[PDB]
Design a binder for these strands. Structure first.
Lengths: 100, 103, 178, 232, 91, 129
RNA sequence: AGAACCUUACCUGGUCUUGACAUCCACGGAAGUUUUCAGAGAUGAGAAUGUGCCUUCGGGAACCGUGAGACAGGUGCUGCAUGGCUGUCGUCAGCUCGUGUUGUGAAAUGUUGGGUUAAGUCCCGCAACGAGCGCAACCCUUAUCCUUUGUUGCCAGCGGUCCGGCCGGGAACUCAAAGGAGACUGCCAGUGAUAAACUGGAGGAAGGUGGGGAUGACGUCAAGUCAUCAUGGCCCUUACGACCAGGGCUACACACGUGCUACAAUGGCGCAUACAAAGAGAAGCGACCUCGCGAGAGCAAGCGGACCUCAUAAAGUGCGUCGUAGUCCGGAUUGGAGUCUGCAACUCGACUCCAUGAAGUCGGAAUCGCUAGUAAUCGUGGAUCAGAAUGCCACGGUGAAUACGU
């Protein structure tokens, strides 16, 4: 795949960035290890809470070309069965069938 | 006087073209001075993979594929006007890649 | 069938007894792949035997060995509407293997303070044999006596093959000559 | 049952890739993607067109695009103005400068891709058709390559169900690795469904673009040289 | 049993209402969807509410309830069976 | 044969390595004693038997280095090294080895795992069916 | 291939209708930056701020906002509309055409017969002959040998180092990975149609494509795929679209398929102790050192990996101890506390410490994998991956039993 899930992921990448990204460097020293307290409580920890989404947990991403999720590699950013198709083809350099 | 610096590196898919590239630069480099050598083989990479064979379902199956990467030390420890370039190219390109830094 | 034919798989002799039957006794005592443990059990286990019977380890040992393993066993399968366990000779080596597996079987019976003591155990047991396994296997002997039964068939084997024949089994198919 | 692409097996032993650039894991992917984007962004200008296909390289710190035409005058245009428009279309898409590329196809019904597509275009569209295949085979035999197979599916004849027909001449080994050969398989759309075409061309026992092994080292390496033994 | 990172989460989407609510009293329960968020010293002495999926479920917070999450107060879900539920009660 | 003579042994791709001089019956393995390598163990005698068979147990050596795999495969590999390596010490040694089968390589060679197997091979304990 | 969220299909509540995504066209604003507040947030309103790019300085383009006819959008149906892709018989030895002959014909002959094989494999021979594809080679992998080379590798003779090739030194050797050699029943003896082939033996590192892999013909279940992707038909757009907070995908007296783990003693526990392969790491991996019981954290050499870490791999080996006691075994359950990623570990994640504690005594009608570096059995690594496997993919360690018979 749906254009809405694709999108979202590209929006998110994006938003994030303004937030995550910069933040994060803060998280952590404002809660977590670190923090004083003044911090963490939240507030200072709402810097993490308000953006969210932008978080890596989500960001993810995913395939990409097909969009798709939970079925892709990534080293190629590609689905997979589309990796594969591709490979037969030779559209990825150095990539071949395989035997041992 | 010659030296160490440089480093050189050479990568890539590929044997090949690594290599031809060897090569272009290592016979060059012999060439000017040196400061060479014999190119070492150095480990290649050989990755890989297993993927679903059907688009849907599956038991079992799956799939299996490989890529790949030749590597590389070529190697050379010192730059020269003809090995500079190449070094330029090697990079110009693409199917190879080239790093020069001593580190 | 299968086709294709191939048998047992070769084994080295194993270093204490210089024998391939010893390993074989190690593995048939082995569990998983722990050949170092397993060897340690077999030599402990025979050193207890071993004290256990005889005065040495090897004198066992053949008493177990003899066991416990046999000379006969049964072959299955199937004959008309039913299947039978018909007697046959064991395989010379397999047996063993018989087994070596029965002495380990089992062991394992088991109970446990050491294997291993379990050996082993039964060697003491087996071996005297009297051991469990020796009773094992006796089962064989079983049985198989069972089964004695018959196996041949069924008419066809007993089947239809007249040769020397006394059978009329297997061989083509034979009239006069040329 | 199912088969391998002759091609794909292949690559790196008899057949070049596709694309030819280095990238990787931090840039591989991305790139792969750019590519995928080139493809779809360039190939809608190609499609009108006699281009069969394209190969991407990348040299450099550019992109790229080698094009096999087919045709080449139809993509070069008047005094080269377009091949400049092609590219400008590369680029756009892409993050680098871009270059086009030329390529020539080729004996055009030898391919596959161009033979297919020629029959996919007739089936699109639709015409009496059927035929086409016969043809294409004759063509390709033709022009060059030692054998060719074609297959056409989807649905055939307008439809209620699904479907498929084939023809193919000369050739065509399958298990022979290796070499090379080529091959492909292409599709697509028409008002009743998808339509699909396969083509396999055996060139004979001839060597490919590579391969796999290099030539012997021992002539080269020789023992008479001075060295070194490292390290100094 | 299970545990979580020290300095547990409070959330802002709840805190924006907790600061209003303790001044307003409660007179109606606080509501909220936060959930997740931890029970802090704070929010003690009022009724929260907590969503869930759907309805809001009112619970008064003493506290004894600090360090728990709002969603524990709420249950999301029910079934049906053996179980579900007590024996017991009749409806 | 000589010295100082040599043999490489390996395995299961381990590896190993073996250097031999006049002597032996002294042995060093890796730098390391044989007791500091085959504590435990059957293996060890496996390292080895090829010296007993010809074999040479008190006439040579021995200096050995071995790498990779594990202590039983090392070892096997020794092994191939000592068999190989001894060929120089030997003129009938190899023939005496091979008669076995000692000159061989490895074997083993390992197999691998494949898709759907699991080991390798193996597989699952079912076929559906 | 790793569902707290996202992903997401589903539910409750909030909420939008040319739209989150997208193209033509016109009108108003540069894109953008900064910032306050209501609200679960979506969303809405207010405030400050930039005035770019191309340029004929007229005007134009980019990007944002608004607006209409179209239209976008749809993980929404249809796999009996269809392509591409795949399961499986099964690496099974088959499949097929041309011409001639033969039958009114379906079709036969060849493709069956004789010897032989892993095999429509090879050979012999006949109104059948000729020819193509499959089988088989190629090509990757494994290892004996010959040869060039030498750091991020190696160390025989020489040397410092209280013992790391660390370094002066060295290229015999390992290894790395590049090129070359070898296997053809070839050779000798026997059998047989002096064939092909097979048995026996020597030679050889290996004996019969040395071993393993890729490889899946022709044809099929009116097989699976709307959930890679493609695309026809049908359908909503007053939405089968879309944004956000929370919930659900994980509920529970059930049953099954497949996997793990234990019941111990050729086992567990405490101490001493030996020998690996492989693989990842530029907002990442990581020793020494420091802190804590510890997860982990701090500090920090090294590195993009032949340069480092996981790592004394464990089983195994040495020593003490247990005696079948539901244990010195098992350690589900369950209380308390600490560590970790992340917006966030409540339902519902992972790791560590203390405490607690149950079934289980090797298991029915029955059943499955494997012929040797195999099975059995011990440990390691990776994809996917904020974090997070007892599955999957690959790795090395120890390493059997038995194969009469058909």
């Amino acid at each position: 795949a749906k254009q809405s899930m694709k999108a979202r992921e590209v929006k998110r990448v994006a938003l994030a960035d303004k937030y995550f990204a910069k933040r994060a460097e803060l998280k952590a020293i404002i809660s977590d290890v670190n923090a004083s307290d003044e911090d963490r409580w939240n507030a200072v920890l709402k810097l993490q809470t308000l953006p969210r989404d932008s978080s890596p947990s989500r960001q993810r991403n995913r395939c990409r070309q097909t969009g798709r999720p939970h079925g892709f590699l990534r080293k190629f950013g590609l689905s997979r069965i589309k990796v594969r198709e591709a490979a037969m083809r030779g559209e990825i350099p150095g990539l071949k069938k395989a035997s041992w | 006087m010659q030296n160490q610096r440089i480093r050189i590196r050479l990568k890539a898919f590929d044997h090949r073209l690594i290599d031809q590239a060897t090569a272009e630069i290592v016979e060059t480099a012999k060439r000017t001075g040196a400061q060479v050598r014999g190119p070492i083989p150095l480990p290649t990479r050989k990755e890989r993979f297993t993927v679903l064979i059907s688009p849907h379902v599956n038991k079992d199956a799956r799939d299996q594929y490989e890529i790949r990467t030749h590597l590389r030390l070529v190697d050379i420890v010192e730059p020269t006007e003809k090995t500079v370039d190449a070094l330029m190219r090697l990079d110009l390109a693409a199917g190879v890649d080239v790093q020069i830094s001593l580190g | 069938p299968r086709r294709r034919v191939i048998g047992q798989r070769k084994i080295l002799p194993d270093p204490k007894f210089g024998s391939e039957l010893l390993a074989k006794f190690v593995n048939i005592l082995m569990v998983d792949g722990k050949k170092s443990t397993a060897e340690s059990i077999v030599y402990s286990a025979l050193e207890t035997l071993a004290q256990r019977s005889g005065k040495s380890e090897l004198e066992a040992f053949e008493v177990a060995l003899e066991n416990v393993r046999p000379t006969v066993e049964v072959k299955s399968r199937r004959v008309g509407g039913s299947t039978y366990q018909v007697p046959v000779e064991v395989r010379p080596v397999r047996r063993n293997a018989l087994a070596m597996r029965w002495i380990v079987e089992a062991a394992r019976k088991r109970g446990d303070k050491s294997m291993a003591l379990r050996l082993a155990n039964e060697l003491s047991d087996a071996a005297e044999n009297k051991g469990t396994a020796v009773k094992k296997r006796e089962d064989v002997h079983r049985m198989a006596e069972a089964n004695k039964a018959f196996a041949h068939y069924r008419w066809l084997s007993l089947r239809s093959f007249s040769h020397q024949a006394g059978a009329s089994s297997k061989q083509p198919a034979l009239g006069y000559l040329n | 049952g199912q088969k391998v692409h002759p091609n794909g097996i292949r690559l790196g032993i008899v057949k070049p890739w596709n694309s030819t650039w280095f990238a990787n894991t931090k840039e591989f992917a991305d790139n792969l993607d750019s590519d995928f984007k080139v493809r779809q962004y360039l190939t809608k200008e190609l499609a009108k067109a006699s281009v069969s296909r394209i190969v991407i390289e990348r040299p450099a710190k550019s992109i790229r695009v080698t094009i096999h035409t087919a045709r080449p005058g139809i993509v070069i245009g008047k005094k080269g103005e377009d091949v400049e428009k092609l590219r400008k279309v590369v680029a756009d898409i892409a993050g680098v400068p871009a270059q086009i590329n030329i390529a020539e196809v080729r004996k055009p019904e030898l391919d596959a891709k161009l033979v297919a597509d020629s029959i996919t275009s007739q089936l699109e569209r639709r015409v009496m058709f059927r035929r086409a295949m016969k043809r294409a085979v004759q063509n390709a035999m033709r022009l060059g390559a030692k054998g060719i197979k074609v297959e056409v599916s989807g649905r055939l004849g307008g439809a209620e169900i699904a479907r498929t027909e084939w023809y193919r001449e000369g050739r065509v080994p399958l298990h022979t690795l290796r070499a090379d050969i080529d091959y492909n398989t292409s599709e697509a759309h028409t008002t009743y469904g998808v339509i699909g075409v396969k083509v396999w061309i055996f060139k004979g026992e001839i060597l490919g673009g590579m391969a796999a092994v290099e030539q012997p080292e021992k002539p080269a390496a020789q023992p008479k040289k001075q060295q070194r033994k490292g390290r100094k | 049993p299970r545990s979580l990172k020290k300095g547990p989460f409070i959330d802002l989407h709840l805190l924006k209402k907790v600061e209003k609510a303790v001044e307003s009293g409660d007179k109606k329960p606080l509501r909220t969807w936060s959930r997740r968020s931890t029970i802090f010293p704070n929010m003690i002495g009022l009724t929260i509410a907590v969503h869930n999926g759907r309805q809001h479920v009112p619970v008064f917070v003493t506290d004894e309830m600090v360090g728990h999450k709002l969603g524990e107060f709420a249950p999301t879900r029910t079934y049906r069976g053996h179980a579900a539920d007590k024996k017991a009660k009749k409806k | 044969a000589e010295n100082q003579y040599y043999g490489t042994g390996r395995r299961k791709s381990s590896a190993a390595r073996v250097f031999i001089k006049p002597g032996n019956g002294k042995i060093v393995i890796n730098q390391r004693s044989l007791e500091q390598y085959f504590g435990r163990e059957t293996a060890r005698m496996v390292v080895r038997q090829p010296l007993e068979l010809v074999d040479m147990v008190e006439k040579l050596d021995l200096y050995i280095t071995v790498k990779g795999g594990g202590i039983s495969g090392q070892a096997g590999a020794i092994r191939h090294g000592i068999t190989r390596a001894l060929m120089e010490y030997d003129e009938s040694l190899r023939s005496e080895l091979r008669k076995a089968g000692f000159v061989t390589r490895d074997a083993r060679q390992v197999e691998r795992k494949k898709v759907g197997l699991r080991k390798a091979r193996r597989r699952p304990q079912f076929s559906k069916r």
